[PDB]
């Protein structure tokens, strides 16, 4: 569809793996909030959203409740066919160019996830790392995949190197995408 | 409509009730609401598909659980005195809400304190016959509580419901009492010349729902059940 | 003002009943708002999906709930049958999209950061152009005065997820003195085009 | 909140709200029962209307204003507004505090009068009759807490086409009588006592 400006208001997703359920609103293809549904709070993504904006986190989970029924009579009325693992499709990359000694950030992009159950975490010479990291909640995409961002604060470098890893069941084992 | 039962409740300190609401049929959500004089209608909670979805400001001892066909129950423990309220069951499909009838509760502190009515019919003044040629008959039922009472007229032995005024809330014997009993009045009229055919008979009929015939009693008065009082009068040349 | 949101229809059924291995069953509720030269044109889009299959819809262009699949008659007919249904439905491009977009022209829409630019050697000139929104942006190259045309690639737009963009732009040159290569970038939040030139 | 007025008039009624909406809805109850639904507005109207009944809705004031035409003894009742609250579904409603409205009979031919009853070997009590006064008076209570008054109230003789009110006044006293029951009120300087 030719816009403008597309919004939604918003992006409802339940699934029977948990279960779990994700609420969000996007603009423009960015999420500005998500609704944190056990502790029942909005989470806007911008200091200026949460300075001006105001969501009832209650309205999120009236609508979830919602598509957990209409997945239910979903399955009843026809072969309940579980969803097809897509290959998930991984990139790093900088938020800026990266110089030795000055703070940055690396940023993972895990895209045409389905179904939306995936773990990302970062590697450092190999092992773990999780001071510095964040992600996004699933992205939505007009074919109805997903998509979704991991970041990781870090001051470069000399001698470190560093690993995107993700494990989705569209993969046969862990995707190790390294960074440039 | 949506349906809620009982409609009628006593209970005392510390008991436990509970309600059940059948709400109109394809509808899912099944809300209740409590509505007291001191703080008019509240929300408790939503049900959805058989689990709890919205929850007011109540404290846990109000529950409630929803069957797969959508009816629901709600449940009041450690019940006291502010307790006391209808209840309100409704349901909705889409953005209007469909209420049942209401479930009274009273919670009392102590049975003793609940009394039928005693019910009397004061016969037309003549004065009035003469001047009007109208004739009002006056039913007076008095010292009942709690306020669960439905008056009626009857006339050669069906119902009447022209010429009835009933009163629409009861006056209290004692107004400081939080315990107070009631009085309730209603007025029958008819033309004069009904009034004086001594074939004419006229009765007025209260339904009190009270105790069960299940529950303990050891005052030393009658047990006060769930009963009908009336009081009669013919007419008179 | 609170925002507001596009409530996700309830199926009919049933009861019915209700729903270890790895498998899952997936839906979505898509509520989507397009707007054109402000609000002068606004569409309404909501999506009812079952894993990846679109099975019924609402679009404002129709004004009815629309079958999509052979899934979706029994949901789109049940939903057209409810009149304060799809009155509610009907009535949420005004009562949802446009009082959000409202917000929006507050926030988002006054939204402007200005890129980052420098240039660097490589591993060729790149002209990277970082932590930009919104995204409307032109990059290019020039050659003294001259725009270079050729030996020139682009990254696409890249989105950081983090509500700011970058795109790197590339040029492949041999060098002779005294030219002077610069890279001239335009966007929305700029006073002035930002210029960056490369030395030697 | 109180309204009344004579049947026939119209009666306007007001309720405000404080959270954005996208619809408010007006119930009426009667005591001791269930609400029933009269009329929806969604926040993209200003009017609308259906059979004797107006809604208006001022987005901006947050206000609503219900409009009865050529009112009836049956719309007296409690009236309450109701808005969603943007929740747009469920059961769950915020319900403000209720306009009281009462629909008062046009009396034709006034014959206010005070009358003594009697049942009378049965009972103690004396009642007195406060009848066919018009709609502008009203009754006050006691004092003497052991004289009970009730408040007016209208019946309807359907096939006459009559309409009165009365109130009701009784007690044991024994000094108490019909003349003095009433005192606490402004009757019609015109009463009959007999
Ligand atoms: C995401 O990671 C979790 C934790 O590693 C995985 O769950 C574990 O899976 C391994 C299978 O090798 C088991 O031995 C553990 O018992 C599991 N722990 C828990 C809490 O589940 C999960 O499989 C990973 N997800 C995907 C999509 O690969």
């Given at each position: 569809?030719?816009?403008?400006?597309?919004?939604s208001?918003?992006v409802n997703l339940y699934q029977s793996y948990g279960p779990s359920g994700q609420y969000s609103?996007e603009?423009?293809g960015?999420e500005?909030?998500?609704?944190?549904?056990?502790?029942?709070?909005?989470?806007?993504?911008?200091?200026?959203?949460?300075?001006?904006?105001?969501?009832?986190?209650?309205?999120?989970?009236?609508?979830?409740?919602?598509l957990?029924?209409?997945l239910?009579?979903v399955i009843?009325?026809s072969?309940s066919t579980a969803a097809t693992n897509e290959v998930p499709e991984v990139t790093?990359?900088?938020?800026?160019?990266?110089?030795?000694?000055?703070?940055?950030?690396?940023?993972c992009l895990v895209d045409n996830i389905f179904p939306p159950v995936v773990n990302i975490?970062?590697?450092?010479?190999?092992?773990?790392?999780?001071?510095?990291?964040?992600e996004t909640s699933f992205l939505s995409k007009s074919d109805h995949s997903f998509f979704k961002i991991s970041?990781?604060?870090?001051?470069?470098?000399?001698?470190?190197?560093?690993?995107?890893?993700v494990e989705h069941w569209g993969l046969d084992?862990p995707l190790?995408?390294?960074?440039? | 409509?949506?349906?809620?039962?009982?409609?009628?409740?006593?209970?005392?300190?510390?008991?436990?009730?509970?309600?059940?609401?059948?709400?109109?049929?394809?509808?899912?959500?099944?809300?209740?609401?409590?509505?007291?004089?001191?703080?008019?209608?509240?929300?408790?909670?939503?049900?959805?598909?058989?689990?709890?979805?919205?929850?007011?400001?109540?404290?846990?001892?109000?529950?409630?659980?929803?069957?797969?066909?959508?009816?629901?129950?709600?449940?009041?423990?450690?019940?006291?005195?502010?307790?006391?309220?209808?209840?309100?069951?409704?349901?909705?499909?889409?953005?209007?809400?469909?209420?049942?009838?209401?479930?009274?509760?009273?919670?009392?502190?102590?049975?003793?304190?609940?009394?039928?009515?005693?019910?009397?019919?004061?016969?037309?003044?003549?004065?009035?016959?003469?001047?009007?040629?109208?004739?009002?008959?006056?039913?007076?039922?008095?010292?009942?509580?709690?306020?669960?009472?439905?008056?009626?007229?009857?006339?050669?032995?069906?119902?009447?419901?022209?010429?009835?005024?009933?009163?629409?809330?009861?006056?209290?014997?004692?107004?400081?009492?939080?315990?107070?009993?009631?009085?309730?009045?209603?007025?029958?009229?008819?033309?004069?010349?009904?009034?004086?055919?001594?074939?004419?008979?006229?009765?007025?009929?209260?339904?009190?729902?009270?105790?069960?015939?299940?529950?303990?009693?050891?005052?030393?008065?009658?047990?006060?059940?769930?009963?009908?009082?009336?009081?009669?009068?013919?007419?008179?040349? | 003002?609170?925002?507001?949101?596009?409530?996700?229809?309830?199926?009919?059924?049933?009861?019915?009943?209700?729903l270890?291995s790895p498998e899952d069953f997936v839906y979505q509720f898509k509520?989507?708002?397009?707007?054109?030269?402000?609000?002068?044109?606004?569409?309404?889009?909501?999506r009812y999906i079952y894993n990846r299959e679109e099975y019924?819809?609402?679009?404002?262009?129709?004004?009815?709930?629309?079958?999509?699949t052979?899934l979706?008659?029994?949901?789109?007919?049940?939903?057209?049958?409810?009149?304060?249904?799809?009155?509610?439905?009907?009535?949420?491009?005004?009562?949802?999209?446009?009082?959000?977009?409202?917000?929006?022209?507050?926030?988002?829409?006054?939204?402007?950061?200005?890129?980052?630019?420098?240039?660097?050697?490589?591993?060729?000139?790149?002209?990277?152009?970082?932590?930009?929104?919104?995204?409307?942006?032109?990059?290019?190259?020039?050659?003294?005065?001259?725009?270079?045309?050729?030996?020139?690639?682009?990254?696409?737009?890249?989105?950081?997820?983090?509500?700011?963009?970058?795109?790197?732009?590339?040029?492949?040159?041999?060098?002779?003195?005294?030219?002077?290569?610069?890279?001239?970038?335009?966007?929305?939040?700029?006073?002035?085009?930002?210029?960056?030139?490369?030395?030697? | 909140?109180?309204?009344?007025?004579?049947?026939?008039?119209?009666?306007?009624?007001?309720?405000?709200?404080?959270?954005?909406?996208?619809?408010?809805?007006?119930?009426?109850?009667?005591?001791?029962?269930?609400?029933?639904?009269?009329?929806?507005?969604?926040?993209?109207?200003?009017?609308?209307?259906?059979?004797?009944?107006?809604?208006?809705?001022?987005?901006?004031?947050?206000?609503?204003?219900?409009?009865?035409?050529?009112?009836?003894?049956?719309?007296?009742?409690?009236?309450?507004?109701?808005?969603?609250?943007?929740?747009?579904?469920?059961?769950?409603?915020?319900?403000?505090?209720?306009?009281?409205?009462?629909?008062?009979?046009?009396?034709?031919?006034?014959?206010?009068?005070?009358?003594?009853?009697?049942?009378?070997?049965?009972?103690?009590?004396?009642?007195?009759?406060?009848?066919?006064?018009?709609?502008?008076?009203?009754?006050?209570?006691?004092?003497?807490?052991?004289?009970?008054?009730?408040?007016?109230?209208?019946?309807?003789?359907?096939?006459?086409?009559?309409?009165?009110?009365?109130?009701?006044?009784?007690?044991?006293?024994?000094?108490?009588?019909?003349?003095?029951?009433?005192?606490?009120?402004?009757?019609?300087?015109?009463?009959?006592?007999?």
């Amino acid at each position: 569809i030719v816009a403008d400006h597309v919004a939604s208001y918003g992006v409802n997703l339940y699934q029977s793996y948990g279960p779990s359920g994700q609420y969000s609103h996007e603009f423009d293809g960015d999420e500005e909030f998500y609704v944190d549904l056990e502790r029942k709070e909005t989470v806007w993504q911008l200091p200026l959203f949460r300075r001006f904006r105001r969501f009832d986190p209650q309205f999120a989970l009236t609508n979830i409740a919602v598509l957990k029924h209409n997945l239910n009579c979903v399955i009843k009325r026809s072969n309940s066919t579980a969803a097809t693992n897509e290959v998930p499709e991984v990139t790093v990359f900088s938020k800026s160019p990266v110089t030795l000694g000055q703070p940055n950030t690396l940023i993972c992009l895990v895209d045409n996830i389905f179904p939306p159950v995936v773990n990302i975490t970062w590697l450092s010479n190999g092992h773990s790392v999780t001071e510095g990291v964040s992600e996004t909640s699933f992205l939505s995409k007009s074919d109805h995949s997903f998509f979704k961002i991991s970041y990781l604060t870090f001051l470069p470098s000399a001698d470190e190197i560093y690993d995107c890893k993700v494990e989705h069941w569209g993969l046969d084992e862990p995707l190790l995408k390294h960074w440039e | 409509g949506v349906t809620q039962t009982p409609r009628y409740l006593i209970k005392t300190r510390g008991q436990q009730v509970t309600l059940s609401c059948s709400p109109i049929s394809g509808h899912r959500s099944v809300s209740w609401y409590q509505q007291t004089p001191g703080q008019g209608l509240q929300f408790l909670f939503e049900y959805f598909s058989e689990t709890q979805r919205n929850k007011g400001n109540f404290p846990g001892r109000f529950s409630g659980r929803q069957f797969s066909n959508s009816r629901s129950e709600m449940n009041v423990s450690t019940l006291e005195l502010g307790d006391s309220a209808l209840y309100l069951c409704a349901s909705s499909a889409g953005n209007t809400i469909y209420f049942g009838e209401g479930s009274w509760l009273t919670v009392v502190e102590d049975l003793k304190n609940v009394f039928p009515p005693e019910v009397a019919v004061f016969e037309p003044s003549e004065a009035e016959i003469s001047h009007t040629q109208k004739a009002t008959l006056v039913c007076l039922a008095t010292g009942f509580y709690p306020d669960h009472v439905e008056l009626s007229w009857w006339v050669n032995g069906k119902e009447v419901h022209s010429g009835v005024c009933t009163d629409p809330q009861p006056l209290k014997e004692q107004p400081a009492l939080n315990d107070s009993r009631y009085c309730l009045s209603s007025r029958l009229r008819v033309s004069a010349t009904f009034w004086q055919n001594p074939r004419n008979h006229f009765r007025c009929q209260v339904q009190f729902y009270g105790l069960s015939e299940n529950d303990e009693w050891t005052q030393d008065r009658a047990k006060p059940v769930t009963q009908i009082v009336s009081a009669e009068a013919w007419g008179r040349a | 003002v609170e925002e507001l949101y596009l409530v996700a229809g309830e199926e009919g059924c049933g009861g019915g009943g209700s729903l270890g291995s790895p498998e899952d069953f997936v839906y979505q509720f898509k509520g989507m708002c397009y707007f054109t030269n402000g609000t002068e044109r606004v569409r309404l889009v909501t999506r009812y999906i079952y894993n990846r299959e679109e099975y019924a819809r609402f679009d404002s262009d129709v004004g009815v709930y629309r079958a999509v699949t052979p899934l979706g008659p029994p949901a789109a007919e049940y939903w057209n049958s409810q009149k304060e249904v799809l009155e509610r439905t009907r009535a949420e491009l005004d009562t949802v999209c446009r009082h959000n977009y409202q917000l929006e022209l507050r926030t988002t829409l006054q939204r402007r950061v200005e890129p980052t630019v420098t240039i660097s050697p490589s591993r060729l000139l790149v002209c990277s152009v970082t932590d930009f929104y919104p995204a409307q942006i032109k990059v290019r190259w020039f050659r003294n005065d001259q725009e270079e045309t050729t030996g020139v690639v682009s990254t696409p737009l890249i989105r950081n997820g983090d509500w700011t963009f970058q795109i790197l732009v590339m040029l492949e040159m041999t060098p002779q003195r005294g030219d002077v290569y610069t890279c001239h970038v335009e966007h929305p939040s700029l006073q002035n085009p930002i210029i960056v030139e490369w030395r030697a | 909140q109180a309204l009344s007025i004579q049947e026939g008039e119209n009666a306007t009624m007001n309720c405000s709200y404080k959270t954005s909406i996208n619809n408010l809805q007006w119930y009426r109850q009667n005591s001791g029962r269930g609400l029933v639904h009269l009329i929806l507005i969604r926040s993209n109207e200003r009017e609308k209307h259906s059979g004797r009944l107006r809604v208006t809705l001022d987005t901006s004031k947050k206000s609503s204003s219900l409009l009865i035409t050529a009112s009836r003894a049956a719309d007296t009742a409690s009236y309450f507004c109701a808005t969603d609250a943007g929740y747009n579904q469920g059961g769950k409603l915020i319900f403000g505090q209720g306009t009281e409205l009462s629909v008062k009979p046009n009396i034709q031919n006034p014959d206010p009068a005070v009358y003594q009853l009697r049942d009378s070997k049965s009972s103690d009590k004396s009642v007195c009759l406060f009848t066919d006064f018009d709609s502008q008076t009203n009754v006050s209570q006691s004092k003497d807490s052991d004289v009970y008054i009730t408040d007016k109230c209208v019946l309807d003789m359907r096939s006459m086409d009559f309409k009165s009110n009365s109130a009701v006044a009784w007690s044991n006293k024994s000094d108490f009588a019909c003349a003095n029951a009433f005192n606490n009120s402004i009757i019609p300087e015109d009463t009959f006592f007999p």
